[PDB]
């Protein structure tokens, strides 16, 4: 029943999908909050030893300059799948469309890599549920959750991982229909400090935004006609700033 990708259950569904979901819940807590001019995405880092460099873990990886991600679930699965995601994005949708793809479209490709890893029995699907946030000039700022069940959902605010259930009511309570990015950045840290305490500090919590265009990150100038990276990773020093004013 539960226990092949091939076998359907009496009430249906594959069990491997359910067990892969279990994996996510053993993960770390990542959460996203949509503001009216951004999306803030936040997660923490752990590594066991403190002798570990924390700036070497990849968990906030830009897929494109327009679209950042986090995960909860398996660490190994992330790096591989981020790698694959990027590769597909240029083949199907940057050699054709001529620019880095839509937030909606790219979320569908990611789901399609998962889906292929469910169809082929003896091959497990990815351990991760990602949050993929981005911007496009048609559908605006957007936020998604793409599950290891190969389905994706759009969301207003969401959290995934172990601490998800505690975070979601904070999100219900504290979300309002009109927010700024700066009130979202503070709400993001506040909620994430529920997930852990005794170790939360600006050098071990990794937090980024997909906000407004920044020509500061564009790296070539004197071309006004294109936009710069929507994405911005905030440094360790910024994360400490926001944690003091909170």
């Amino acid at each position: 029943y539960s226990f092949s990708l091939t076998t359907f259950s009496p009430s249906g569904k594959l069990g491997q999908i359910d067990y892969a979901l279990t994996a996510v819940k053993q993960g770390v807590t990542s959460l996203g909050i949509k503001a009216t001019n951004g999306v803030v995405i936040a997660t923490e880092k752990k590594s066991s030893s403190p002798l570990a460099m924390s700036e070497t873990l990849s968990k906030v990886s830009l897929l494109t300059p327009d679209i950042g991600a986090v995960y909860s679930g398996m660490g190994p699965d992330y790096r591989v799948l981020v790698d694959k995601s990027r590769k597909v994005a240029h083949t199907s949708y940057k050699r054709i469309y001529g620019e880095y793809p839509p937030t909606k479209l790219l979320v569908s490709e990611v789901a399609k890599i998962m889906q292929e890893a469910t169809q082929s029995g003896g091959v497990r699907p990815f351990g991760v549920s990602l949050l993929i946030a981005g911007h496009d000039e048609f559908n605006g700022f957007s936020l998604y959750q793409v599950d290891p069940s190969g389905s994706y959902f759009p969301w207003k605010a969401t959290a995934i991982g172990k601490g998800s259930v505690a975070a979601k009511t904070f999100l219900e309570k504290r979300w309002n229909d009109e927010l700024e990015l700066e009130d979202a950045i503070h709400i993001a840290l506040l909620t994430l400090k529920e997930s852990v305490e005794g170790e939360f500090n600006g050098d071990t919590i990794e937090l980024a935004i997909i906000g407004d265009e920044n020509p500061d990150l564009l790296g070539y100038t004197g071309i006004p006609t294109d936009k710069g990276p929507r994405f911005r990773k905030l440094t360790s020093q910024e994360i400490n700033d926001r944690l003091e004013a909170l």
């Binding site: 990886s61 790698d83 990027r86 790296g219 070539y220 004197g222």
Partner: protein, 226 residues
């Protein structure tokens, strides 16, 4: 077309004209001959416009993919080697001539690459139709070690001689200055040698000066219930 590169101490400049000719007729008066491989690598195209355009795009996506993968700054050095490989595979059945230059942490580099897969390094290069006309200007007027100032002046001078003696090189000069650890400066239409001459009559007339037979609306959108 004409393309030059001038190596200087604190970076490298790549200049190329805006006109594109496909036969004896001018395809475009203004259209870019500075294609973007990566934010710190730029290159200009010569030869058949289609082959250069396609190649730059193909290699460009791979070097942006590489930057993310190696989690460090895009090398000029990566780019050339990968590009060279790409060129080899067709066996010279692709007609791309390029000057690629950039700044990376290994420093500034200025390369020439041919359709065959012959590869060269100098401290001053050119390729294209009007390469012989610019080459003369570089060898004489260049010396080893330059400031920003002298490099930009010498680059626009070479294209400018290009326009005046080369048929396929025309119109304006677009210059891109890549200094080591600084933003590329894309200075669109830095130099004009000859501005436009206007036409001497107005050619706009009333309607019915051109005959109509039928007038129709063609669809482009979906109707409602009205």
């Amino acid at each position: 077309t004409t393309i030059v590169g001038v190596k200087f101490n604190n970076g490298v400049v790549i200049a190329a004209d805006t006109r594109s000719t496909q036969g004896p007729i001018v395809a475009d008066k203004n259209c870019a001959k500075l294609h973007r491989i990566s934010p710190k690598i730029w290159c200009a195209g010569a030869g058949t416009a289609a082959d250069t355009e396609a190649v730059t795009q193909l290699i460009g996506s791979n070097i942006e993919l590489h930057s993310l993968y190696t989690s460090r700054e895009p090398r000029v050095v990566s780019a050339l080697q990968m590009l060279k490989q790409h060129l080899f595979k067709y066996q010279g059945h692709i007609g791309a001539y390029l000057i690629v230059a950039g700044v990376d942490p290994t420093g500034s580099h200025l390369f020439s690459i041919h359709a065959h897969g012959s590869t060269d390094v100098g401290y001053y290069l050119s390729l294209g139709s009007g390469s012989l006309a610019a080459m003369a200007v570089l060898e004489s007027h260049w010396k080893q070690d330059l400031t920003k100032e002298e490099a930009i002046k010498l680059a626009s001078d070479a294209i400018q001689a290009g326009i005046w003696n080369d048929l396929g090189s025309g119109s304006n000069v677009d210059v891109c200055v890549m200094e080591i650890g600084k933003d590329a400066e894309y200075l669109r239409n830095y130099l004009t040698p000859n501005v436009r001459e206007e036409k001497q009559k107005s050619y706009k007339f009333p309607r019915g000066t051109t005959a109509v037979l039928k007038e129709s609306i063609v669809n482009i959108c979906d109707i409602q219930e009205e």
